[PDB]
Design a protein around this ligand. Structure first.
Ligand SMILES: N=C(N)Nc1ccc(C(=O)Oc2ccc3cc(C(=N)N)ccc3c2)cc1
Length: 245
């Protein structure tokens, strides 16, 4: 996350931290995700497509720090790693950039709500907040494009939903942005998602509830003028999601 504020998991209790264990025993951070039901985390296919072996991934819930334990965190194995059959990468854009991770503890449990762990609602089919709506993003991603380290403490910020009209302009992303994506940026371009925030939530109030409106997917740089964050448009993927859950 560029700009915004350090937070704790209690402020984003659906946030999932996804790591990969390496042959040698090193475990490193992959991507964010979102708890959408007790057994299911949603994230971005591009996080996993290069190494789609469920056995080498760990999911934490209730975790506020990247490389140390949080009291109230819970560790899960990936019972099922479901990538989108129609994922593809352009020069910038990722298409159908959505993934499901079916979680289970070695004890065989799915998630239990607590002070640090809660599910996030899905939107209804094709239902999105109006353009100019303020939404929250969260992640362990870089605090500056040019950084080589990730922050140790979870961050969040607020961005505004941008019209496709505005996002499709040629000095923005022109062609690369489709109707299965949502753009969101700061009107002063001072705060954004960045590398390491992929798969993380874009959360909006919609039809009365905090809703998972988007999944952090891609962008040219981070907090660059006329280069918004691009998100997977969750509202378009409900039948895909229901088919697995
Ligand atoms: N094996 C993996 N998990 N790889 C991997 C997985 C994910 C990423 C990653 O996080 O890629 C990006 C990079 C830049 C981004 C910029 C913006 C933006 N301006 N809002 C948004 C998202 C971005 C995402 C990188 C690598």
């Amino acid at each position: 996350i560029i700009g915004g504020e350090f937070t704790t998991i209690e402020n984003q209790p659906w946030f999932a931290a996804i790591y990969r264990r390496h042959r040698g025993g090193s475990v490193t951070y992959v991507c964010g995700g979102s708890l959408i039901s007790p057994c299911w985390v949603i994230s971005a296919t591009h996080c996993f497509i290069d190494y789609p072996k469920k056995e080498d991934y760990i999911v934490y819930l209730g975790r506020s720090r990247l490389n140390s334990n949080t009291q109230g965190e819970m560790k899960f194995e990936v019972e099922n790693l479901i990538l989108h059959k129609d994922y593809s990468a352009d020069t910038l854009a990722h298409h159908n950039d959505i993934a499901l991770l079916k979680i289970r503890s070695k004890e065989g449990r799915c998630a239990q709500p607590s002070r640090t762990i809660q599910t996030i609602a899905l939107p209804s089919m094709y239902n999105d907040p109006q353009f100019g709506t303020s939404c929250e993003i969260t992640g362990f991603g870089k605090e500056q494009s040019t950084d080589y380290l990730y922050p140790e403490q979870l961050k969040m910020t607020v961005v505004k939903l941008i019209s496709h009209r505005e996002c499709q302009q040629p000095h923005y992303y022109g062609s690369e942005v489709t109707t299965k994506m949502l753009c969101a940026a700061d009107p002063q371009w001072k705060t954004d998602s960045c590398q390491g925030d992929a798969g993380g939530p874009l959360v909006c109030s919609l039809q009365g509830r905090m809703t998972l409106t988007g999944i952090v997917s891609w962008g040219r740089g981070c907090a660059l003028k006329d280069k918004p964050g691009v998100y997977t448009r969750v509202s378009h993927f409900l039948p895909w999601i229901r088919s697995h859950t």
